[PDB]
Structures are given as C-alpha cells and as structure tokens.
Coordinates of C-alpha atoms in Angstrom, one line a residue:
Chain A
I1 CA -43.5 18.6 14.7
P2 CA -46.6 17.5 17.0
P3 CA -45.3 16.5 20.3
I4 CA -45.6 13.4 22.0
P5 CA -48.5 13.4 24.6
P6 CA -47.2 13.2 28.3
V7 CA -48.1 10.0 30.1
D8 CA -48.2 9.6 34.0
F9 CA -45.9 6.7 34.0
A10 CA -46.5 6.2 37.7
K11 CA -50.1 5.0 37.2
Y12 CA -48.9 1.7 35.9
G13 CA -46.3 1.0 38.5
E14 CA -43.2 2.3 40.5
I15 CA -41.1 4.6 38.4
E16 CA -37.5 6.3 38.9
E17 CA -36.1 9.5 37.3
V18 CA -32.5 9.3 36.2
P19 CA -31.0 12.3 34.5
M20 CA -29.2 12.6 31.2
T21 CA -25.6 13.5 31.3
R22 CA -25.0 17.0 29.2
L23 CA -23.3 14.6 26.5
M24 CA -26.3 12.4 25.9
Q25 CA -28.4 15.7 25.6
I26 CA -25.9 17.1 23.0
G27 CA -26.0 13.8 21.4
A28 CA -29.8 13.6 21.5
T29 CA -30.1 17.0 19.8
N30 CA -27.6 16.3 17.2
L31 CA -29.1 13.2 16.2
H32 CA -32.7 14.3 16.0
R33 CA -31.4 17.4 13.9
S34 CA -29.7 15.0 11.4
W35 CA -32.8 12.9 11.4
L36 CA -35.1 15.6 10.4
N37 CA -32.6 17.3 7.7
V38 CA -31.3 14.1 5.9
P39 CA -33.5 11.9 3.9
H40 CA -31.6 8.6 4.9
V41 CA -31.2 5.4 2.8
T42 CA -29.0 2.4 4.0
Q43 CA -27.2 0.2 1.5
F44 CA -26.2 -3.1 2.8
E45 CA -23.3 -5.2 1.5
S46 CA -20.9 -7.8 2.9
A47 CA -17.2 -8.2 2.0
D48 CA -15.1 -11.1 2.0
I49 CA -12.4 -10.6 4.5
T50 CA -10.9 -14.1 4.9
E51 CA -7.5 -12.8 3.4
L52 CA -7.7 -9.6 5.2
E53 CA -8.2 -11.4 8.5
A54 CA -5.1 -13.9 7.9
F55 CA -2.8 -10.8 7.2
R56 CA -4.1 -9.2 10.4
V57 CA -3.3 -12.1 12.4
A58 CA 0.2 -12.8 10.7
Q59 CA 1.4 -9.2 11.5
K60 CA 0.3 -9.5 15.3
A61 CA 4.2 -9.8 15.7
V62 CA 5.1 -6.4 13.9
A63 CA 2.0 -4.9 15.5
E64 CA 3.1 -5.9 19.1
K65 CA 7.0 -5.0 18.4
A66 CA 5.5 -1.5 17.5
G67 CA 3.0 -1.4 20.7
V68 CA -0.2 -1.0 18.8
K69 CA -2.9 -3.7 18.4
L70 CA -3.8 -4.2 14.8
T71 CA -7.6 -4.5 14.6
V72 CA -10.1 -4.1 11.5
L73 CA -10.5 -0.4 12.0
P74 CA -7.1 0.6 10.6
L75 CA -7.8 -1.4 7.5
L76 CA -11.4 -0.1 7.3
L77 CA -10.0 3.6 7.6
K78 CA -7.4 3.0 5.1
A79 CA -9.7 1.5 2.5
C80 CA -12.4 4.0 2.8
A81 CA -9.6 6.8 2.6
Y82 CA -8.7 5.5 -0.8
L83 CA -12.4 5.2 -1.8
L84 CA -13.2 8.8 -0.5
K85 CA -10.5 10.0 -2.9
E86 CA -11.9 7.8 -5.8
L87 CA -15.5 8.8 -5.4
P88 CA -15.3 12.5 -4.2
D89 CA -19.1 13.1 -3.8
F90 CA -18.9 11.0 -0.6
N91 CA -16.3 13.3 0.7
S92 CA -18.4 16.5 0.4
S93 CA -21.1 18.4 2.3
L94 CA -24.1 20.3 0.8
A95 CA -23.6 24.0 0.9
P96 CA -26.1 26.1 3.0
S97 CA -27.8 27.5 0.0
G98 CA -28.7 23.8 -1.0
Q99 CA -27.5 24.5 -4.5
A100 CA -23.9 23.4 -4.3
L101 CA -21.6 20.7 -2.9
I102 CA -18.6 21.7 -1.0
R103 CA -16.0 19.0 -2.0
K104 CA -13.2 18.6 0.5
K105 CA -9.8 17.8 -0.8
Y106 CA -8.8 16.5 2.6
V107 CA -9.9 13.2 4.1
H108 CA -10.3 13.2 7.9
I109 CA -12.5 10.3 9.2
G110 CA -14.2 10.0 12.5
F111 CA -15.1 6.7 14.3
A112 CA -17.5 6.0 16.9
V113 CA -16.4 5.4 20.5
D114 CA -19.0 4.4 23.0
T115 CA -18.0 5.8 26.5
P116 CA -20.0 5.9 30.0
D117 CA -20.9 9.4 29.5
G118 CA -22.1 9.0 25.8
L119 CA -21.1 8.6 22.5
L120 CA -17.9 10.4 21.1
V121 CA -16.5 10.5 17.6
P122 CA -12.7 11.4 17.5
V123 CA -11.4 12.4 14.2
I124 CA -8.1 11.2 12.6
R125 CA -7.0 13.7 10.2
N126 CA -5.4 13.0 6.8
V127 CA -6.1 9.2 7.1
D128 CA -5.1 9.1 3.3
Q129 CA -1.3 9.8 4.5
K130 CA -0.9 7.4 7.2
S131 CA 0.0 3.7 7.5
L132 CA -1.7 0.8 9.1
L133 CA 0.4 0.9 12.2
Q134 CA 0.2 4.8 12.5
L135 CA -3.6 4.7 12.1
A136 CA -3.7 1.9 14.8
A137 CA -1.7 3.9 17.3
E138 CA -3.7 7.0 16.9
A139 CA -7.1 5.2 16.9
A140 CA -6.0 3.5 20.2
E141 CA -5.0 6.9 21.7
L142 CA -8.0 9.0 20.8
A143 CA -10.2 5.9 22.0
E144 CA -8.5 6.1 25.3
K145 CA -8.5 9.9 25.7
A146 CA -12.4 9.8 24.7
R147 CA -12.9 7.4 27.6
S148 CA -10.9 9.2 29.9
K149 CA -12.8 12.7 29.2
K150 CA -9.4 14.0 28.2
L151 CA -10.5 14.4 24.5
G152 CA -10.2 18.2 23.5
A153 CA -13.0 19.4 21.4
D154 CA -10.4 20.1 18.6
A155 CA -10.3 16.4 17.9
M156 CA -14.1 16.2 17.5
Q157 CA -14.2 18.5 14.3
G158 CA -14.1 18.6 10.7
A159 CA -14.4 15.0 9.9
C160 CA -15.4 14.1 6.3
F161 CA -17.0 10.6 6.8
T162 CA -17.7 8.4 10.2
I163 CA -17.1 4.7 10.6
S164 CA -19.3 3.1 13.3
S165 CA -18.0 -0.4 14.3
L166 CA -20.1 -2.7 16.4
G167 CA -18.6 -5.8 15.1
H168 CA -17.1 -6.3 18.5
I169 CA -20.5 -6.7 20.3
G170 CA -22.4 -8.4 17.5
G171 CA -25.3 -7.9 15.1
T172 CA -26.0 -8.6 11.5
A173 CA -26.5 -5.1 10.2
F174 CA -28.1 -1.8 11.5
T175 CA -29.1 1.4 9.9
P176 CA -26.7 4.2 11.4
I177 CA -27.7 8.1 11.1
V178 CA -25.5 10.3 9.1
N179 CA -23.9 12.8 11.4
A180 CA -24.7 15.9 9.1
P181 CA -23.0 18.0 7.6
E182 CA -21.4 14.8 6.5
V183 CA -23.0 12.9 3.9
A184 CA -22.4 9.3 4.6
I185 CA -21.5 6.8 7.6
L186 CA -20.5 3.2 7.5
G187 CA -21.8 0.8 10.0
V188 CA -19.7 -2.4 10.5
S189 CA -21.2 -5.6 12.2
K190 CA -19.8 -8.9 13.2
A191 CA -18.0 -11.2 10.7
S192 CA -19.2 -14.6 10.5
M193 CA -18.2 -17.7 8.3
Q194 CA -20.9 -18.1 5.6
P195 CA -21.1 -20.3 2.6
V196 CA -20.3 -18.7 -0.4
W197 CA -20.6 -20.2 -4.1
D198 CA -17.5 -20.8 -5.8
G199 CA -19.2 -21.6 -9.3
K200 CA -19.4 -25.3 -8.2
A201 CA -19.9 -25.7 -4.3
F202 CA -20.2 -23.7 -1.4
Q203 CA -16.9 -22.6 0.2
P204 CA -16.9 -21.0 3.7
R205 CA -15.6 -17.5 3.5
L206 CA -15.4 -15.0 6.5
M207 CA -18.0 -12.2 5.8
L208 CA -18.0 -8.6 7.3
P209 CA -21.6 -7.0 7.2
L210 CA -21.1 -3.3 6.0
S211 CA -24.3 -0.8 6.2
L212 CA -23.9 2.4 4.4
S213 CA -26.4 5.2 5.4
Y214 CA -26.2 8.3 3.2
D215 CA -27.8 11.5 2.4
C216 CA -29.7 10.7 -0.7
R217 CA -30.2 14.5 -1.9
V218 CA -26.4 14.4 -2.7
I219 CA -25.9 10.6 -3.2
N220 CA -28.2 8.6 -5.3
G221 CA -28.9 5.0 -4.9
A222 CA -26.6 3.7 -7.9
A223 CA -23.7 5.8 -6.4
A224 CA -23.9 4.3 -3.0
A225 CA -24.2 0.7 -4.4
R226 CA -21.2 1.4 -6.4
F227 CA -19.3 2.7 -3.1
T228 CA -20.2 -0.6 -1.1
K229 CA -19.3 -2.6 -4.1
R230 CA -15.7 -0.8 -4.5
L231 CA -15.3 -1.1 -0.5
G232 CA -16.1 -4.9 -0.6
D233 CA -13.6 -5.3 -3.4
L234 CA -10.8 -3.5 -1.8
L235 CA -11.3 -5.3 1.6
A236 CA -11.3 -8.6 -0.3
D237 CA -7.8 -7.6 -1.6
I238 CA -6.2 -4.6 0.1
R239 CA -3.3 -4.8 -2.4
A240 CA -5.5 -3.0 -4.8
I241 CA -4.9 0.3 -2.7
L242 CA -1.2 0.0 -3.8
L243 CA -1.8 0.5 -7.5
Chain B
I1 CA 47.4 -2.6 -13.9
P2 CA 49.7 -4.8 -16.1
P3 CA 48.3 -4.6 -19.8
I4 CA 47.1 -7.5 -21.9
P5 CA 49.7 -8.5 -24.3
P6 CA 48.6 -7.9 -28.1
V7 CA 48.0 -10.9 -30.1
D8 CA 47.8 -11.1 -33.9
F9 CA 44.4 -12.6 -34.3
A10 CA 44.7 -12.9 -38.0
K11 CA 47.5 -15.6 -37.6
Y12 CA 44.9 -18.2 -36.6
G13 CA 42.3 -17.3 -39.3
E14 CA 40.1 -14.7 -41.1
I15 CA 39.2 -11.6 -38.6
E16 CA 37.0 -8.6 -39.1
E17 CA 37.0 -5.3 -37.1
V18 CA 33.8 -3.8 -36.0
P19 CA 33.7 -0.7 -34.1
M20 CA 32.3 0.3 -30.7
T21 CA 29.6 2.9 -30.4
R22 CA 30.7 5.7 -28.1
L23 CA 27.9 4.6 -25.9
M24 CA 29.5 1.3 -25.5
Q25 CA 33.0 2.9 -24.9
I26 CA 31.3 5.1 -22.1
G27 CA 29.8 1.9 -20.6
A28 CA 33.1 -0.1 -20.8
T29 CA 34.9 2.7 -19.0
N30 CA 32.3 3.1 -16.2
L31 CA 32.3 -0.7 -15.6
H32 CA 35.8 -1.2 -15.3
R33 CA 36.1 2.0 -13.1
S34 CA 33.5 0.4 -10.8
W35 CA 35.5 -3.1 -10.9
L36 CA 38.5 -1.8 -9.8
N37 CA 37.1 0.6 -7.1
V38 CA 34.3 -1.5 -5.4
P39 CA 35.3 -4.9 -3.6
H40 CA 32.0 -6.8 -4.7
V41 CA 30.1 -9.5 -3.0
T42 CA 27.0 -11.1 -4.3
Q43 CA 24.3 -12.2 -2.0
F44 CA 21.7 -14.7 -3.5
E45 CA 18.2 -15.2 -2.3
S46 CA 15.0 -16.4 -4.0
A47 CA 11.4 -14.9 -3.1
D48 CA 8.3 -16.7 -3.1
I49 CA 6.2 -14.7 -5.7
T50 CA 3.1 -17.1 -6.2
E51 CA 0.7 -14.8 -4.8
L52 CA 2.4 -11.6 -6.2
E53 CA 2.0 -13.2 -9.5
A54 CA -1.5 -14.1 -9.0
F55 CA -2.2 -10.3 -8.1
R56 CA -0.3 -9.2 -11.1
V57 CA -2.4 -11.1 -13.5
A58 CA -5.7 -10.3 -11.8
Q59 CA -5.1 -6.4 -12.1
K60 CA -4.5 -6.9 -15.9
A61 CA -8.0 -5.4 -16.6
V62 CA -7.2 -2.1 -14.4
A63 CA -3.7 -2.0 -15.9
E64 CA -5.0 -2.0 -19.4
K65 CA -7.9 0.3 -18.6
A66 CA -5.0 2.6 -17.3
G67 CA -2.9 1.9 -20.7
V68 CA 0.1 0.3 -18.9
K69 CA 1.1 -3.2 -18.8
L70 CA 1.6 -4.2 -15.1
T71 CA 4.9 -6.3 -15.1
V72 CA 7.1 -7.4 -12.0
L73 CA 9.4 -4.3 -12.3
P74 CA 6.9 -1.7 -10.9
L75 CA 6.3 -4.2 -7.7
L76 CA 10.1 -4.6 -7.4
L77 CA 10.6 -0.9 -7.5
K78 CA 8.1 -0.3 -4.9
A79 CA 9.4 -2.9 -2.6
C80 CA 12.9 -1.7 -2.8
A81 CA 11.9 1.8 -2.3
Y82 CA 10.4 0.7 1.0
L83 CA 13.4 -1.2 2.0
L84 CA 15.9 1.5 1.0
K85 CA 13.9 3.8 3.6
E86 CA 14.0 1.0 6.2
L87 CA 17.7 0.1 5.6
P88 CA 19.4 3.5 4.9
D89 CA 23.0 2.3 4.5
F90 CA 21.7 0.9 1.3
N91 CA 20.5 4.2 0.2
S92 CA 23.9 6.1 0.5
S93 CA 27.3 6.8 -1.1
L94 CA 30.9 6.8 0.3
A95 CA 32.0 10.4 0.6
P96 CA 35.2 11.3 -1.3
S97 CA 37.2 11.8 1.9
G98 CA 36.6 7.6 2.5
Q99 CA 35.7 8.5 6.1
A100 CA 31.9 9.4 5.7
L101 CA 28.8 8.1 4.0
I102 CA 26.4 10.5 2.4
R103 CA 23.0 9.2 3.3
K104 CA 20.5 10.3 0.9
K105 CA 16.9 11.2 2.1
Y106 CA 15.4 10.6 -1.3
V107 CA 14.8 7.4 -3.2
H108 CA 15.4 7.4 -7.1
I109 CA 15.9 4.2 -8.6
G110 CA 17.5 3.2 -12.0
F111 CA 16.7 0.1 -14.1
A112 CA 18.9 -1.4 -16.8
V113 CA 17.4 -1.1 -20.3
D114 CA 19.6 -2.9 -22.9
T115 CA 19.3 -1.2 -26.4
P116 CA 21.2 -1.6 -29.6
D117 CA 23.8 1.1 -28.8
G118 CA 24.5 -0.1 -25.5
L119 CA 23.0 -0.4 -22.0
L120 CA 21.1 2.6 -20.7
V121 CA 19.8 3.0 -17.0
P122 CA 16.9 5.7 -16.8
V123 CA 16.1 6.9 -13.2
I124 CA 12.6 7.1 -11.8
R125 CA 12.5 9.8 -9.1
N126 CA 11.0 9.5 -5.8
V127 CA 9.9 6.0 -6.4
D128 CA 8.7 5.9 -2.9
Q129 CA 5.9 8.4 -3.5
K130 CA 4.5 6.7 -6.7
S131 CA 2.0 4.0 -7.0
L132 CA 2.1 0.9 -8.9
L133 CA 0.3 2.0 -12.0
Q134 CA 2.2 5.3 -11.8
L135 CA 5.7 3.6 -11.6
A136 CA 4.3 1.2 -14.4
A137 CA 3.6 3.9 -16.9
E138 CA 6.9 5.9 -16.1
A139 CA 9.2 2.8 -16.5
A140 CA 7.5 2.1 -20.0
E141 CA 8.1 5.6 -21.2
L142 CA 11.6 5.8 -20.0
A143 CA 12.3 2.4 -21.6
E144 CA 10.7 3.6 -25.0
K145 CA 12.7 6.8 -24.9
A146 CA 15.9 4.9 -24.1
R147 CA 15.5 2.6 -27.2
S148 CA 14.6 5.6 -29.4
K149 CA 17.6 7.7 -28.3
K150 CA 15.3 10.4 -27.1
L151 CA 16.3 9.8 -23.5
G152 CA 17.9 13.3 -22.2
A153 CA 21.0 12.9 -19.9
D154 CA 19.0 14.4 -17.1
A155 CA 17.1 11.2 -16.7
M156 CA 20.3 9.0 -16.3
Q157 CA 21.4 10.8 -13.1
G158 CA 21.2 10.9 -9.4
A159 CA 20.1 7.3 -8.7
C160 CA 20.3 5.6 -5.4
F161 CA 20.2 2.0 -6.4
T162 CA 19.8 0.0 -9.7
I163 CA 17.4 -2.9 -10.5
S164 CA 18.7 -5.0 -13.4
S165 CA 16.1 -7.6 -14.5
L166 CA 16.9 -10.3 -16.9
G167 CA 14.0 -12.5 -15.9
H168 CA 12.5 -12.1 -19.3
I169 CA 15.4 -13.5 -21.2
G170 CA 16.5 -16.5 -18.7
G171 CA 19.1 -17.5 -16.2
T172 CA 19.2 -18.8 -12.8
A173 CA 21.4 -16.0 -11.1
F174 CA 24.2 -13.7 -12.2
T175 CA 26.7 -11.3 -10.4
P176 CA 25.8 -7.8 -11.4
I177 CA 28.5 -5.0 -11.1
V178 CA 27.7 -2.0 -8.7
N179 CA 27.3 1.2 -10.8
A180 CA 29.4 3.2 -8.4
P181 CA 28.9 5.7 -6.7
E182 CA 25.7 3.8 -5.6
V183 CA 26.5 0.9 -3.1
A184 CA 24.3 -2.1 -4.3
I185 CA 22.4 -3.3 -7.4
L186 CA 19.6 -6.0 -7.5
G187 CA 19.9 -8.6 -10.3
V188 CA 16.7 -10.3 -11.1
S189 CA 16.5 -13.6 -13.0
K190 CA 13.7 -15.9 -14.5
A191 CA 11.4 -17.3 -12.1
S192 CA 10.4 -21.0 -12.0
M193 CA 8.2 -23.3 -10.1
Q194 CA 10.1 -25.0 -7.3
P195 CA 9.3 -27.5 -4.7
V196 CA 9.2 -26.0 -1.4
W197 CA 8.8 -27.7 1.9
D198 CA 5.7 -26.9 3.8
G199 CA 6.8 -28.8 7.0
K200 CA 5.3 -31.9 5.8
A201 CA 5.5 -32.2 1.9
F202 CA 6.9 -30.2 -1.3
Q203 CA 4.5 -27.7 -2.6
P204 CA 5.2 -26.0 -5.9
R205 CA 5.9 -22.3 -5.4
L206 CA 6.7 -19.8 -7.9
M207 CA 10.5 -18.6 -7.1
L208 CA 12.0 -15.6 -8.3
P209 CA 15.9 -15.6 -8.1
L210 CA 17.5 -12.5 -6.5
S211 CA 21.3 -11.4 -6.8
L212 CA 22.4 -8.5 -4.7
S213 CA 25.7 -7.3 -5.5
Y214 CA 27.0 -4.8 -2.9
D215 CA 30.1 -2.7 -2.0
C216 CA 31.3 -4.6 0.8
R217 CA 33.4 -1.4 2.3
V218 CA 30.0 0.1 3.1
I219 CA 27.8 -2.9 3.7
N220 CA 29.0 -6.0 5.5
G221 CA 27.8 -9.7 4.8
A222 CA 25.0 -9.6 7.5
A223 CA 23.5 -6.4 6.4
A224 CA 23.3 -7.6 2.9
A225 CA 21.8 -11.1 3.9
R226 CA 19.2 -9.2 6.0
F227 CA 18.3 -6.8 3.0
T228 CA 17.5 -9.7 0.5
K229 CA 15.8 -11.7 3.4
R230 CA 13.4 -8.5 4.0
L231 CA 13.1 -8.1 0.1
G232 CA 12.0 -11.9 0.0
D233 CA 9.5 -11.3 2.6
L234 CA 8.0 -8.2 1.2
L235 CA 7.6 -9.8 -2.2
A236 CA 5.9 -12.9 -0.7
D237 CA 3.3 -10.6 0.9
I238 CA 3.5 -7.0 -0.5
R239 CA 0.7 -6.0 2.0
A240 CA 3.5 -5.6 4.4
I241 CA 4.2 -2.2 2.7
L242 CA 0.9 -1.0 3.9
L243 CA 1.8 -0.8 7.5

C-alpha cells in the first residue's frame, strides 16, 4: 500500500510527541488488518424500544435486589443470541481456504469496553444459555476487570459477534469495523423520542439506532437487512424470544 | 368409613342402569383416595392477562406457520415451570415415612384432558426446557392421542404438578382435587373483562380466574398465597421469565 509522505509538523507550529500504549498499537494493527481484509457494508435500522424501556425500568427493584444494574446491553445480548441461532451465517467465519464457512454451534458475544489504555472486548460465553440478570452481572464484572487491567487474555477470545454500544455518550449512528475473523458487529447509538406514523397520526416512540457492519463476502445485502429487521422486531417485543 | 345406605331407586320411578368404563372406575378410586388422604385448601386469585392475550393473538401467524395453535395452556405451563423452580416445595411429594419431603429436581407437568371414556392427564416432561411453540405442539399431540385411546401409560407418569383448564367451557372458579402424590393442582376458569381500579378510575382488564388447591400438610396458607400471587405477576408480564 503506498505510504503516507512524512510531514515536518514542527514547520507549522509547536508540537509535542506522546507515545502509544502497547494496547493502542495492538488495536491499531488489528483494525487496519480488518479494514484491508474485509469489504465492509453498514446496514442501518432503528428499533422501537418503548416497551423494552418500560420493562427495564420496572425491573429496577429485582435487578437491585440481585446486585446488578439492568441496562440495555443484557437485552441486546439475549436478542442477538437468539438471532445468531436463527440466522447461522452470522455466527460463522470464513475458512482460511476462502472456499468454506466454518459455522459455529456455540454463541459467545464480545462487547466493546473503552478503557484508558485502549479498547478491550471481553467475551461472554454461551450468551444463549444465560438469563437477563446473569448476563447483567457478567457484563458488569468483565467491564470492571477490563478497566482495572485484571482481564486475563482468555476472556478476549473466541467470540462469534461483537456489540459496540455508544448510546451512553451520544450519536445518531456510526459505521463500526468488523473484528475479523468474525463476520459482523452491531453498533448501538443513543435512543431518542421520534414521531412514528400509526397509520393515522404521529405517535412518539422511543427509537434505538442500530448499525450493523458486515463482511459482504459472506453476508449479502438482503441477509443483512433481514437480520436488522428481525432484531428490530425482537426488541420491539422481547417476548418473541420465548416461543 | 360408614357406607351410604342402599336405596331402591325404582320405588320413585323408572330407572335404567348404565355401566362405568374401567377408566371411570380407575379415576373414581384415585380421587377418593386423594380426597381421604390429602387435607385440601383452595387458594383463589385472578391474573391480569390483557397483555398476554394481545401477545397470543399477535403470534397467530408464527404459530400457524409452525402448525401449532398457540392457546393459553403453553403460557400457563411455562410460567408454572418457572415458578416450580422458584418455590421448590410445590415441586415435591411427601415421603411414605410422613417425615420427609422428596424434592424433585425435574419439572414435568400434567394437564387434564377430558375424553369420552373419562379424564386423562398426559404429562409433558421437562416443561422448563421447552419453548412456547414446542409446548404448544406437544400438548396438542398428547391431547389427540388421549382422545384416540393411543396414549401409552408411560405418558401418564411422574408428573410434578397438574393444570386443569376449564376456561374453554365456563365458570368463575372451582375447587380441584390434588392428584396425590403431587402436592398442588392449578384450576383455570373463563377469562372475562373486569373493572380494575387504576388508582383513579376503573379500567377494563381481562382477568383469568386461578384456583390453586394444595396439600396443606406440606404447603401452608401463606406459601400458597405467595405462589398464586407470583403466578398472577408472571402472567401479567411474561417477560419476567426472561430474567
């Protein structure tokens, strides 16, 4: 790849050199390797979470009696796990021969935690078998160990899919980079009240912006629109997971 | 027990003798054995199922694409299974020594099917592991085999709890008899629109009458009021099962 020409930045004013943590450099290398290896498309969608939000907030009591804080992430994890089982091409990697897909029969999902030293993505194993408060506890633990440098490399491995949630900071949508060898990543942004047509008038519904980046060698455009559509459907009524 | 004095019924008019199917006689003996062995109390409650009903009816599409009819029974089964795990004394039997309870670590639930030849109670095994449409299919199959005399004795055994639903015929409530050695049975009657106080006015909510009979040697009055209260809570928002 043609390199970027060096510039003497000090010709234009005062500069200062700060160094990169090894964690940032590892991260830098991994993203650029994904970038050049995966042809990326982002599919955007927004889900109606008015009812999900009401549930979240009502179970604040239960969650606190169990010591966890029920946020939107355990709900996101549960729903993507159900869906990764319904649409198995999202739960696979491209074989090194380029001629086969390795479909995984397990569902472990990573989630982005941004710490001082860099971004870490802890992995929760067998998300499909854990409950909303179990996933809530685990997420919280892994996030804390990630911030406190106590996260052993074991827990950063063998994920099938990544969720990256920035809803707690802001933004309308973003285009995340697929953490290869996984084949998709779900970006989640800030929810806001939007007017939604009820067939007769605009009702305010709470809308969650979803941004699915995927590896289009493996997942074609229609399979991906169907994944964010099913996800939007499941988050609008999470009871559909029960059937 | 003092016998009932024989009466010549033909002194008062014309009589006719029809006989009992062996199935009815078996049933007769089992109920009278339960009646004299179990001191019975019925706890009545009613659950708000307006939202449950809306869900049921929306998933009519899915249910039909899967060949099952989603009725209230799979929902009842799923919720009691969750609860039989939360409150394990309901999932046990009294040891023959009268001094111990055998707590079962499994959840199989029977449901009353009334056929021409008598009442049968098929058992669905490990209700706690099956989904709403799985339970829907299984219930339907067992009911059909029960009506067609093709139900092998294997499937009438080892239940932990019974549900008896008469909501499809009518009634406000009833007092079911515990099928000993189980320790409780849930009677379900007809749902109707009732006025329920919202703190300010009466709102129409769809109410399901629940009638829990139990063996009060094993389950005391407060444990039983708490079981129908948790059940009413779970049916008002079945998403609580997810956490």
